Amino acid sequence: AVKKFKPYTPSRRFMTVADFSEITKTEPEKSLVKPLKKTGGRNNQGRITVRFRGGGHKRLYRIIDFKRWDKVGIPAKVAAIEYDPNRSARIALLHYVDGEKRYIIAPDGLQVGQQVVAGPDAPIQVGNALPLRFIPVGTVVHAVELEPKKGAKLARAAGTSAQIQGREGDYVILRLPSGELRKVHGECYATVGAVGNADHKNIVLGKAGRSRWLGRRPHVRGAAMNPVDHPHGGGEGRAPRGRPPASPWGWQTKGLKTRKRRKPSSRFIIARRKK
Amino acid sequence: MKRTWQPNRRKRAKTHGFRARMRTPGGRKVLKRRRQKGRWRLTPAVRK
RNA sequence: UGGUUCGUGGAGCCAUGGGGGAAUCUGGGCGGACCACCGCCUAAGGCUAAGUACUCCGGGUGACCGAUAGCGCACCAGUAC
RNA sequence: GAGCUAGCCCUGGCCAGGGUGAAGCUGGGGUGAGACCCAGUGGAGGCCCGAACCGGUGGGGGAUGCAAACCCCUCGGAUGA
RNA sequence: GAAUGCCGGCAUGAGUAACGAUAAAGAGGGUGAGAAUCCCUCUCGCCGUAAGCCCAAGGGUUCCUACGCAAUGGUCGUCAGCGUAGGGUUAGGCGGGACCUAAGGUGAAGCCGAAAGGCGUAGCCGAAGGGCAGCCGGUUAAUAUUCCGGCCCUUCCCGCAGGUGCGAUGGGGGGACGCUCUAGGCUAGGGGGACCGGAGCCAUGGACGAGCCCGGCCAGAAGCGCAGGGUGGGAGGUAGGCAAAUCCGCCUCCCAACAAGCUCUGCGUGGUGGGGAAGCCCGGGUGACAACCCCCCGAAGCCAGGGAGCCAAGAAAAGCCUCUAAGCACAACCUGCGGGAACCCGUACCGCAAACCGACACAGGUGGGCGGGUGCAAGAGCACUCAGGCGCGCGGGAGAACCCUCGCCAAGGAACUCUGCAAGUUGGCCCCGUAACUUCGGGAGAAGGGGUGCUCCCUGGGGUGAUGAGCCCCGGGGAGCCGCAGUGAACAGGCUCUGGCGACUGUUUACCAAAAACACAGCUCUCUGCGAACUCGUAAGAGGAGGUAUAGGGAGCGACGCUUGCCCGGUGCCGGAAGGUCAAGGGGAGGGGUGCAAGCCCCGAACCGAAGCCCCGGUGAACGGCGGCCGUAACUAUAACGGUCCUAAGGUAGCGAAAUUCCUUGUCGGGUAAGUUCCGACCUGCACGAAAAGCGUAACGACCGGAGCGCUGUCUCGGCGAGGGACCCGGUGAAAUUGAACUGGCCGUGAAGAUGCGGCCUACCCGUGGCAGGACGAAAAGACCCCGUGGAGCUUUACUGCAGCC
RNA sequence: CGAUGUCGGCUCGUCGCAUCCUGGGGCUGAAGAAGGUCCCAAGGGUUGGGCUGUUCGCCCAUUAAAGCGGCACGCGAGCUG
RNA sequence: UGGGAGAGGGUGGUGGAAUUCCCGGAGUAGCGGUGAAAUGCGCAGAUACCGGGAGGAACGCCGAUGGCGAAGGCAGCCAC
RNA sequence: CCGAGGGUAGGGCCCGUGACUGGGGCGAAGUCGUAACAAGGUAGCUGUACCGGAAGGUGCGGCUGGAU
Ligand SMILES: O=C(N[C@H](CO)[C@H](O)c1ccc([N+](=O)[O-])cc1)C(Cl)Cl
Ligand SMILES: [Mg+2]
Ligand SMILES: [Mg+2]
Ligand SMILES: [Mg+2]
Ligand SMILES: [Mg+2]
Ligand SMILES: [Mg+2]
Ligand SMILES: [Mg+2]
Ligand SMILES: [Mg+2]
Ligand SMILES: [Mg+2]
Ligand SMILES: [Mg+2]
Ligand SMILES: [Mg+2]
Ligand SMILES: [Mg+2]
Ligand SMILES: [Mg+2]
Ligand SMILES: [Mg+2]
Ligand SMILES: [Mg+2]
Ligand SMILES: [Mg+2]
Ligand SMILES: [Mg+2]
Ligand SMILES: [Mg+2]
Ligand SMILES: [Mg+2]
Ligand SMILES: [Mg+2]
Ligand SMILES: [Mg+2]
Ligand SMILES: [Mg+2]
Ligand SMILES: [Mg+2]
Ligand SMILES: [Mg+2]
Ligand SMILES: [Mg+2]
Ligand SMILES: [Mg+2]
Ligand SMILES: [Mg+2]
Ligand SMILES: [Mg+2]
Ligand SMILES: [Mg+2]
Ligand SMILES: [Mg+2]
Ligand SMILES: [Mg+2]
Ligand SMILES: [Mg+2]
Ligand SMILES: [Mg+2]
Ligand SMILES: [Mg+2]
Ligand SMILES: [Mg+2]
Ligand SMILES: [Mg+2]
Ligand SMILES: [Mg+2]
Ligand SMILES: [Mg+2]
Ligand SMILES: [Mg+2]
Ligand SMILES: [Mg+2]
Ligand SMILES: [Mg+2]
Ligand SMILES: [Mg+2]
Ligand SMILES: [Mg+2]
Ligand SMILES: [Mg+2]
Ligand SMILES: [Mg+2]
Ligand SMILES: [Mg+2]
Ligand SMILES: [Mg+2]
Ligand SMILES: [Mg+2]
Ligand SMILES: [Mg+2]
Numbered sequence A: 001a002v003k004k005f006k007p008y009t010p011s012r013r014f015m016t017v018a019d020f021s022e023i024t025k026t027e028p029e030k031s032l033v034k035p036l037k038k039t040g041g042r043n044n045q046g047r048i049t050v051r052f053r054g055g056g057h058k059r060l061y062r063i064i065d066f067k068r069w070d071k072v073g074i075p076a077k078v079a080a081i082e083y084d085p086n087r088s089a090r091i092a093l094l095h096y097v098d099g100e101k102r103y104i105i106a107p108d109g110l111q112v113g114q115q116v117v118a119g120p121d122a123p124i125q126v127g128n129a130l131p132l133r134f135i136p137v138g139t140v141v142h143a144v145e146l147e148p149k150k151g152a153k154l155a156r157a158a159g160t161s162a163q164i165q166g167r168e169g170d171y172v173i174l175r176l177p178s179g180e181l182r183k184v185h186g187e188c189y190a191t192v193g194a195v196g197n198a199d200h201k202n203i204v205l206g207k208a209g210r211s212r213w214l215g216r217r218p219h220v221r222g223a224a225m226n227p228v229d230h231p232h233g234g235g236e237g238r239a240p241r242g243r244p245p246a247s248p249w250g251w252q253t254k255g256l257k258t259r260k261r262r263k264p265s266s267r268f269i270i271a272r273r274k275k
Numbered sequence B: 001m002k003r004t005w006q007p008n009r010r011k012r013a014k015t016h017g018f019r020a021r022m023r024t025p026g027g028r029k030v031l032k033r034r035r036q037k038g039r040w041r042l043t044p045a046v047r048k
Numbered sequence C: 001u002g003g004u005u006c007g008u009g010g011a012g013c014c015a016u017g018g019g020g021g022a023a024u025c026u027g028g029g030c031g032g033a034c035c036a037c038c039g040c041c042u043a044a045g046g047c048u049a050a051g052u053a054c055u056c057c058g059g060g061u062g063a064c065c066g067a068u069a070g071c072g073c074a075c076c077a078g079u080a081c
Numbered sequence D: 001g002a003g004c005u006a007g008c009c010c011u012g013g014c015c016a017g018g019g020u021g022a023a024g025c026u027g028g029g030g031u032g033a034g035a036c037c038c039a040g041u042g043g044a045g046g047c048c049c050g051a052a053c054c055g056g057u058g059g060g061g062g063a064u065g066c067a068a069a070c071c072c073c074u075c076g077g078a079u080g081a
Numbered sequence E: 001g002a003a004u005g006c007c008g009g010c011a012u013g014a015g016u017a018a019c020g021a022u023a024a025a026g027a028g029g030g031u032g033a034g035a036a037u038c039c040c041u042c043u044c045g046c047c048g049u050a051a052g053c054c055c056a057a058g059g060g061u062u063c064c065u066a067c068g069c070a071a072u073g074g075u076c077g078u079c080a081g082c083g084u085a086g087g088g089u090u091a092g093g094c095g096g097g098a099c100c101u102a103a104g105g106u107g108a109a110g111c112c113g114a115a116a117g118g119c120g121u122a123g124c125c126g127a128a129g130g131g132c133a134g135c136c137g138g139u140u141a142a143u144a145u146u147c148c149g150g151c152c153c154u155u156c157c158c159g160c161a162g163g164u165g166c167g168a169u170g171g172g173g174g175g176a177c178g179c180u181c182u183a184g185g186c187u188a189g190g191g192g193g194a195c196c197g198g199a200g201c202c203a204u205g206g207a208c209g210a211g212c213c214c215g216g217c218c219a220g221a222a223g224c225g226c227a228g229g230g231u232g233g234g235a236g237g238u239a240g241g242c243a244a245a246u247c248c249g250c251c252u253c254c255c256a257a258c259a260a261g262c263u264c265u266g267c268g269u270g271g272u273g274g275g276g277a278a279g280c281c282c283g284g285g286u287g288a289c290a291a292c293c294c295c296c297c298g299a300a301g302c303c304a305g306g307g308a309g310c311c312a313a314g315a316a317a318a319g320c321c322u323c324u325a326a327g328c329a330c331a332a333c334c335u336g337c338g339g340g341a342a343c344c345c346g347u348a349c350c351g352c353a354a355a356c357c358g359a360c361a362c363a364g365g366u367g368g369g370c371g372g373g374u375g376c377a378a379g380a381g382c383a384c385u386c387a388g389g390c391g392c393g394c395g396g397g398a399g400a401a402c403c404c405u406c407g408c409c410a411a412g413g414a415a416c417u418c419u420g421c422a423a424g425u426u427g428g429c430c431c432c433g434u435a436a437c438u439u440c441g442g443g444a445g446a447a448g449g450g451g452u453g454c455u456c457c458c459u460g461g462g463g464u465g466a467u468g469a470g471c472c473c474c475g476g477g478g479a480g481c482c483g484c485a486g487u488g489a490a491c492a493g494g495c496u497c498u499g500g501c502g503a504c505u506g507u508u509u510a511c512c513a514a515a516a517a518c519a520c521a522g523c524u525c526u527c528u529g530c531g532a533a534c535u536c537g538u539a540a541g542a543g544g545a546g547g548u549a550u551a552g553g554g555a556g557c558g559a560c561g562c563u564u565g566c567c568c569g570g571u572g573c574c575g576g577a578a579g580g581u582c583a584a585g586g587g588g589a590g591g592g593g594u595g596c597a598a599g600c601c602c603c604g605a606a607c608c609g610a611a612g613c614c615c616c617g618g619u620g621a622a623c624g625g626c627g628g629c630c631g632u633a634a635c636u637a638u639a640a641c642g643g644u645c646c647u648a649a650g651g652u653a654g655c656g657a658a659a660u661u662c663c664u665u666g667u668c669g670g671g672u673a674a675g676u677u678c679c680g681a682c683c684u685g686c687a688c689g690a691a692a693a694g695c696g697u698a699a700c701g702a703c704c705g706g707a708g709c710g711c712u713g714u715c716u717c718g719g720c721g722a723g724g725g726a727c728c729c730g731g732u733g734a735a736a737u738u739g740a741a742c743u744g745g746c747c748g749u750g751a752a753g754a755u756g757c758g759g760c761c762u763a764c765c766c767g768u769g770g771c772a773g774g775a776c777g778a779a780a781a782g783a784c785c786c787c788g789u790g791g792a793g794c795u796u797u798a799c800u801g802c803a804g805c806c
Numbered sequence F: 001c002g003a004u005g006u007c008g009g010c011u012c013g014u015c016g017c018a019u020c021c022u023g024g025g026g027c028u029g030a031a032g033a034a035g036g037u038c039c040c041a042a043g044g045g046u047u048g049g050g051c052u053g054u055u056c057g058c059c060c061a062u063u064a065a066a067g068c069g070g071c072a073c074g075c076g077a078g079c080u081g
Numbered sequence G: 001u002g003g004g005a006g007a008g009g010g011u012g013g014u015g016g017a018a019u020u021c022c023c024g025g026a027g028u029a030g031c032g033g034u035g036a037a038a039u040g041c042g043c044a045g046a047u048a049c050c051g052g053g054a055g056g057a058a059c060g061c062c063g064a065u066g067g068c069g070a071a072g073g074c075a076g077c078c079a080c
Numbered sequence H: 001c002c003g004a005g006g007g008u009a010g011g012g013c014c015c016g017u018g019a020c021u022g023g024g025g026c027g028a029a030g031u032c033g034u035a036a037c038a039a040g041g042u043a044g045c046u047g048u049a050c051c052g053g054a055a056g057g058u059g060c061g062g063c064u065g066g067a068u
């Protein structure tokens, strides 16, 4: 439930902020944080390799448990639900009866005080992790490993989820958040339910400064530049593209497909996304 | 207005100093060159 | 592909990045595509003075300069600046 | 060569005073319960006036300058990109 | 003898401009060969959120004292940041190192690259961040938290005593954190005192006073008091914290809980040790046995790791504490006390500047802290002043033009001009009051008004205290006084109406453009399934991202509202296992050379054989494009209607003489006495039009048009006055330029614009202040233009390659 | 072309006369008054506004009249821009 | 108090038929459509037939001249 | 002191008037087509939506004031 402001400044007219309703704890677990080295889009050569990055609010990285097949059979209590600035989803603090403390991505509907568990024999319940082959067909799932024991790669953003569509040998068929139909190996882990914080898509940044807070420096249009800079640069006055629209590096950018032809995972993608 | 020389002893020593010069192939050519020319100082003096 | 006088030329020879891949003298390379004949040579291991080059240094000599010349510097110069 | 300048990274510092008065909270009214209205409380904002600080709008001076971009008057921002 | 030649020397301009902020000077007395310029005294003026003081950087002896004045100093010089010489910088506690980590840099392992080298985990380096023990006063010509005095404290070594399972680079705790707002109690700092101390003073009409003037503290160990931070105790289980663990984490039970208890800071007190003014008399002495007290104001600093709210969600590591492992428990650790030990470097001085960056003793530039008082609503604003520091390193006269900065002005009041450019006006606070329109916030300080000093009298509430007095803070009513005028000086909006463009706050061409340009939230298309796409790199490796389609890249549009039409024939992109074309390679019909021959060697057809291209489709918020001629209505005119040609399809809505309209000052209306601009209409739109978006739109704008009111030296039309220059005298003394010059007017002539030729006219020699018509005056080997088989940036369906991708 | 600054305005003039006014005339389809047309005449004079960058032009209100040209389309080491 | 009929309303489950698309099979010269046609689709293998899968929407028979609601209106089945 | 009213500034209601623009009513014999009345030759009408020289057409849902 996004929160609105009255128009007492030009920008407050449109600004919207998250409700932070589900959050129950407002400082992070000290043994689960480490410093996040802001890059500013620079690589080890110091070169900008991703334009328009830098100058956002300082952040600490929260360590997230993307395996969970670490602790099979060991139940854990949902102790808190917290804000994570490194991702769109909220995160959940788990107190394992082991005594160990971990963080997971917070699924939709997960309540503080409930218990979750991971393993082949876990109850099909929101927040439980299982190898894909043991989840019933048609179960909405998230935080999906892509290859067995390699780590949850799929459906981690606020509100997203994949749905189990069927089985074939050692493999399951998932409809991904994008709508692609892909085979994923049945021993890959996943967590029942969809990621939480689904209202995240309807936040209205509201003003330029809000983009700056997030680390997003201003984006400059190619048509605003000069020919030394960009295919779309130059022209007396304003100008249309006057050529197939192009990136700064000359490649075409209105429909030109870019997945590499002979990729081995092609044998595992059934249907490309749609829409 | 603010001009272009803003002296800074650490900066001078870390940029042009002897150990900066020795670390790099071009730097050592500078020292060999200035020795062959017979310069009295191979490197800019900075009080440290 | 390079090297050679040889820039694809009738283009051999020497070298070799890729593929295929021998034999031990009755073996093998060369004589400018190739073939025959006639001859020359013995690859895929290594070393080897002297005659040749240069001039920081020393000395000898100039139909070489003589302080705006001769080295940037005859002098506390690769200095002052 | 980034001791000028541009961007980013790490770590510190600075922004007189005054003005406006959001949400929320509380009490009151209202209703089946509500929405909602009123008062007080509150102290939000690329909010307002204005020094420091950062600028450089108009005009005048200066023009072998005080200055290879300065001086006077005036003017923009001043809790935020 | 010339090359705007090179190097050097010396002229001209010229005793000219200038002598670097208009904060300002006068006199007396010293010194000396010499004095506006040095030293002393008195008077004057200037800064005082500095033009005073203290740190950091940078500079590197410039510091102090003696002796000097050739040069440096924009003049002078006896002076000096100058010359010569001598002296001067003192630390266990301040800063840095023998501690820690940040970005980053480096880098056993490892990875990569023709060579050089490029990466890289731990580790190591790296600070103005963390951590860590000293405060007040005195002393020197010159250093002082450093020397000395008083009172405190830290680490290391050894020993004594008491205590304990001691022990680490390992486990754990802690260190450890944002922005805004903010409580209580204090401290810094300040104001007042009829109280305490003090050398004196009585003037010129009055005052011997509850008079004037000066001052009334600082540091302090334990203890104590006030105020705050921090922190549950115990037991049982335990599989987690990469070994172990009694520690921590998880679970259960009892107890305690807005406390207390323990602990840790701040402030107060505190044995004791210091300081101590005016004035007077030579930095000193006296004052002085100085006194050292009460009240108020009160931080942004301190208690602090305090509290609340919010979203953009806010370093690390060591010190420290706890846990155990090897080990060892003659040890070792902890606590108390004692003796010993405690190193290296910096320390002078300048430091918003004459010592730093600007070639200069240069009106510029330079980070942190302190920055008093009174009044003005507040304040670091403004005026004046304290302490402290200065009068800016040429002066003396004169009182022209003209220039700069400043003041005033009769009548008029924008008539000035491209333009009200500039300058007036308005101007703070309190009260009354306030329009269209609107996104309901605003528009708004709208507009427009009234009040503002002083005296007396009556009175309401707060803070401190005690509830009172006193001091301090907000007010209310009534009566009076004076002036031209009461924010009496200084600081301090002119207003309104109406279009264009851009939503807005922001950003930009350092040094001619600040905008309508860029950005911006927001909208759409598109790529990307993660060893993602994409970017940098030969690579390794990075970024993307320790992210995962509510995400990341690319592109255009640009808040918001209402909308965004038709064309897929060409170009692009996307889809298409057919067909057509298609390289290396495979295949080998059939030929050829040579040999006696077995053979060796060369050419080689059908047929098979990728991507790409051809072909078939799709696709516009992909590149793009969206017609001509002729006829027609019962007045005329004009065509709802029709005919035909062409196209891939013939521009919809909305807007329109427009930031677009050539003819054009289109035509009509408005505003004006008069309007090529403006506003509103019309539509034959030379040449609008829908995300290179179309039409609107409240608020916003140092953007650009048009108008009105207010007020003005802008103007009719100029006048006067001020100061700094200009001018004159003394001192110091440039510059570009310069074939040489004994350098006039006219009308002609001349390479076509003559001081220099012809003819005539005019004209004694030489200066000084002024003005700019000429010397085709100076400056810069024309930027425009052309030429050169000159150059460089940029483009593409120019050529030819290369990366990259297939 | 080793530089002759280029529109308009402002300021400052000065000259020509093919004369706009004022002075002197002839002719008239000149009754008077007022004009028309030509001759002589350059002494003096020849206004203030609205629009536009404008020169020019139109318009408003007047006037004896609201002249036309040259001087590097006079004049930027005189100003504006 | 005790009974009843009902597509009355809200929420969440869930069942079969059909249409469309996708994969596999088998098969070949047309399919579709109309008044008649054409556009279109089809040898790059369509239509017609079989197995499999995905997804949305609506509930055949019961059904009525029926029922319920204040009206608008309410129809697979199940629970609250 | 109050005070006719004069002056200044800003609002509210009403009236007249305005380039141009919107539809409306009326007008013996204009141009275009044929929407409705019969099943009016696609039953009509309806709220709304979108489109078109014009009546109208089409979509969704409703009515019978629909015929056979
Ligand atoms: O170019 C200029 N003048 C040159 C003299 O060398 C010449 O007088 C000139 C002036 C104007 C011009 N024009 O207007 O076309 C042409 C040449 C000056 Cl604008 Cl710098
Ligand atoms: Mg809002
Ligand atoms: Mg609102
Ligand atoms: Mg939440
Ligand atoms: Mg940590
Ligand atoms: Mg990184
Ligand atoms: Mg690096
Ligand atoms: Mg590097
Ligand atoms: Mg990028
Ligand atoms: Mg970047
Ligand atoms: Mg993310
Ligand atoms: Mg989150
Ligand atoms: Mg898999
Ligand atoms: Mg979004
Ligand atoms: Mg951020
Ligand atoms: Mg963005
Ligand atoms: Mg942009
Ligand atoms: Mg551009
Ligand atoms: Mg550009
Ligand atoms: Mg470039
Ligand atoms: Mg290019
Ligand atoms: Mg390009
Ligand atoms: Mg272009
Ligand atoms: Mg352009
Ligand atoms: Mg442009
Ligand atoms: Mg254009
Ligand atoms: Mg355009
Ligand atoms: Mg184009
Ligand atoms: Mg392109
Ligand atoms: Mg590519
Ligand atoms: Mg896909
Ligand atoms: Mg600068
Ligand atoms: Mg610097
Ligand atoms: Mg330094
Ligand atoms: Mg430094
Ligand atoms: Mg440095
Ligand atoms: Mg370096
Ligand atoms: Mg160095
Ligand atoms: Mg080398
Ligand atoms: Mg030497
Ligand atoms: Mg060097
Ligand atoms: Mg060769
Ligand atoms: Mg050859
Ligand atoms: Mg080879
Ligand atoms: Mg043998
Ligand atoms: Mg042989
Ligand atoms: Mg042989
Ligand atoms: Mg051979
Ligand atoms: Mg041979």
Ligand SMILES: [Mg+2]
Residues within 6 Å of the ligand: C030, C040, C041
């Ligand atoms: Mg041989």
Ligand SMILES: [Mg+2]
Residues within 6 Å of the ligand: C042
């Ligand atoms: Mg051999």
Ligand SMILES: [Mg+2]
Residues within 6 Å of the ligand: none
């Ligand atoms: Mg041999």
Ligand SMILES: [Mg+2]
Residues within 6 Å of the ligand: none
């Ligand atoms: Mg030899």
Ligand SMILES: [Mg+2]
Residues within 6 Å of the ligand: none
């Ligand atoms: Mg010799």
Ligand SMILES: [Mg+2]
Residues within 6 Å of the ligand: C067
């Ligand atoms: Mg000599």
Ligand SMILES: [Mg+2]
Residues within 6 Å of the ligand: none
């Ligand atoms: Mg010489």
Ligand SMILES: [Mg+2]
Residues within 6 Å of the ligand: C066, C069
């Ligand atoms: Mg000589």
Ligand SMILES: [Mg+2]
Residues within 6 Å of the ligand: none
């Ligand atoms: Mg020599």
Ligand SMILES: [Mg+2]
Residues within 6 Å of the ligand: C072
């Ligand atoms: Mg020489």
Ligand SMILES: [Mg+2]
Residues within 6 Å of the ligand: C079, C080
């Ligand atoms: Mg020397």
Ligand SMILES: [Mg+2]
Residues within 6 Å of the ligand: D002, D003
């Ligand atoms: Mg720099």
Ligand SMILES: [Mg+2]
Residues within 6 Å of the ligand: D015, D078
């Ligand atoms: Mg501020």
Ligand SMILES: [Mg+2]
Residues within 6 Å of the ligand: none
């Ligand atoms: Mg107010």
Ligand SMILES: [Mg+2]
Residues within 6 Å of the ligand: D021
């Ligand atoms: Mg209030």
Ligand SMILES: [Mg+2]
Residues within 6 Å of the ligand: D024, D042
């Ligand atoms: Mg609150």
